[PDB]
């Protein structure tokens, strides 16, 4: 419900519903990605 984020996409569960199911062991880590892969980065990549 913040006004500082534009793109929110989720597959495991709807972000709205969080009281019923409870997340466990959530981790955040910084990575290095260039500016040319703004939307070309996704899980399961078999390119160069």
């Amino acid at each position: 419900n913040s006004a500082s984020f534009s793109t929110f996409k989720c597959y495991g569960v709807s972000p709205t519903k969080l009281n019923d199911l409870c997340f466990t062991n959530v981790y955040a880590d910084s990575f290095v990605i260039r500016g040319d892969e703004v939307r070309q980065i996704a899980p399961g990549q078999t390119g160069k």
């Binding site: 419900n1 006004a3 534009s6 929110f8």
Partner: protein, 48 residues
């Protein structure tokens, strides 16, 4: 349901034109012969 109504995904409501946290509920399937199994569409007929 047949309506191209932008979803009010975010807390702030948006009307007329999609704005912040406003997304189109409908997207299609990227069908491709190279697409892996499971993603392939199955035609279903339901009789009542």
């Amino acid at each position: 349901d047949i309506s191209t109504e932008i979803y009010q995904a975010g807390s702030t409501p948006c009307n007329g034109v999609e704005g912040f946290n406003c997304y189109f509920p409908l997207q299609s399937y990227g069908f491709q012969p190279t697409n892996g199994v499971g993603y392939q569409p199955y035609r279903v007929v339901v009789l009542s």
